[PDB]
Amino acid sequence: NYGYQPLFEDRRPRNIGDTLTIVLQENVSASKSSSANASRDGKTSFGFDTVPRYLQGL
Amino acid sequence: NYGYQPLFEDRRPRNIGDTLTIVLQENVSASKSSSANASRDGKTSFGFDTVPRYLQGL
Ligand SMILES: CCCCCCCCCCCCCCCC(=O)O[C@H](CCCCCCCCCCC)CC(=O)N[C@H]1[C@@H](OP(=O)(O)O)O[C@H](CO[C@@H]2O[C@H](CO)[C@@H](OP(=O)(O)O)[C@H](OC(=O)C[C@@H](CCCCCCCCCCC)OC(=O)CCCCCCCCCCCCC)[C@H]2NC(=O)C[C@@H](CCCCCCCCCCC)OC(=O)CCCCCCCCCCC)[C@@H](O)[C@@H]1OC(=O)C[C@H](O)CCCCCCCCCCC
Numbered sequence: 001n002y003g004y005q006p007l008f009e010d011r012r013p014r015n016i017g018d019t020l021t022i023v024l025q026e027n028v029s030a031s032k033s034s035s036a037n038a039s040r041d042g043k044t045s046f047g048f049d050t051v052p053r054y055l056q057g058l
Numbered sequence: 059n060y061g062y063q064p065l066f067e068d069r070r071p072r073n074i075g076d077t078l079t080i081v082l083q084e085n086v087s088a089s090k091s092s093s094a095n096a097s098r099d100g101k102t103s104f105g106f107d108t109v110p111r112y113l114q115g116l
């Protein structure tokens with residue numbers, strides 16, 4: 001090979017045949033949450049158990 | 059490539075082919091709550107258990 005080569009550079013790959021080292025160190029994490037609620041409660045009462053003579057009509 | 063390249067700048071992407079690193083670090087959280095209540099209670103009573111002779115009419 002007659003190609004020029006720098007002395008002080010970091011010897012990065014530059015041509016087709018050059019080799020490079022890859023450190024994967026891949027780490028991905030995704031999360032998703034959702035919630036919903038709805039509560040309704042009702043309860044009504046009414047009773048005499050004793051009615052006046054004048055109110056017995058109703 | 060014959061393009062001009064600055065020396066002291068932060069080497070940000072500038073053209074179509076430039077590559078950039080994205081750190082997701084996404085975090086969203088939303089909450090919603092609501093409540094309502096209504097209570098009514100009544101209870102009335104009245105009784106003699108002993109009526110005067112003069113009031114026996116009513
Ligand atoms: C937002 C506000 C808007 C305004 C709203 C207006 C009022 C909106 C309307 C509210 C009133 C509900 C109407 C109920 C009767 C009715 O029409 O709808 C019925 C179906 C229900 C539909 C209702 C959905 C509404 C939908 C909701 C709408 C809401 C908006 C059909 C029906 O008719 N079913 C019917 C049938 O059943 P059957 O199907 O099986 O056959 O027959 C059986 C057997 O009949 C009984 O026999 C008895 C003997 O056996 C006999 O006694 P006896 O003496 O003879 O012995 C006895 O005679 C008697 O009461 C003898 C005598 C009693 C006098 C005692 C003193 C009481 C004073 C009491 C004073 C009341 C004080 C408020 O009378 C009366 O003078 C009654 C008083 C009149 C007051 C007038 C108000 C002046 C304003 C005074 C104002 C005061 C100011 C401070 C016989 N009673 C009857 O005939 C029935 C009827 C005869 C009508 C002739 C009298 C003149 C009416 C003249 C005109 C009336 C027009 C309305 O009386 C009533 O109650 C009428 C009540 C009217 C109140 C309105 C208030 C307006 C405010 C005005 C406000 C604007 C009944 O049991 C049964 O009726 C029953 O069960 C009813 C039960 O009792 C009573 C439960 C009440 C609980 C509250 C409701 C709770 C319900 C809630 C859930 C929905």
Ligand SMILES: CCCCCCCCCCCCCCCC(=O)O[C@H](CCCCCCCCCCC)CC(=O)N[C@H]1[C@@H](OP(=O)(O)O)O[C@H](CO[C@@H]2O[C@H](CO)[C@@H](OP(=O)(O)O)[C@H](OC(=O)C[C@@H](CCCCCCCCCCC)OC(=O)CCCCCCCCCCCCC)[C@H]2NC(=O)C[C@@H](CCCCCCCCCCC)OC(=O)CCCCCCCCCCC)[C@@H](O)[C@@H]1OC(=O)C[C@H](O)CCCCCCCCCCC
Pocket residue numbers: 053054055112113114115116
């Ligand atoms: C906001 C204010 C606005 C003003 C409101 C005005 C008052 C608004 C009205 C309030 C009064 C309610 C009227 C009740 C009678 C009525 O009309 O509505 C009835 C249906 C109910 C509707 C009411 C919805 C109102 C809707 C609400 C409206 C509210 C606004 C029809 C009915 O009539 N049903 C009826 C029927 O049933 P049946 O259907 O099954 O057949 O027949 C059976 C059998 O009859 C009995 O037989 C007995 C023998 O067996 C016999 O005795 P004997 O001696 O002979 O032996 C006996 O004779 C007797 O009492 C003998 C004698 C007793 C004397 C003893 C001394 C007592 C003094 C006591 C003194 C009272 C002191 C206040 O008499 C009386 O002089 C009565 C006193 C008169 C006082 C006058 C006031 C002067 C002011 C004095 C003022 C004082 C100043 C300090 C016979 N009694 C009768 O006939 C019935 C009647 C005969 C009437 C002839 C007498 C002259 C009336 C002359 C005129 C009257 C006109 C009103 O008397 C009454 O009560 C009348 C009470 C009037 C009070 C009004 C106060 C006004 C304030 C004035 C205020 C402005 C009864 O049981 C049944 O009636 C009963 O159950 C009733 C029960 O008892 C009593 C419960 C009362 C609890 C409080 C209410 C609680 C109810 C609350 C829930 C709703």
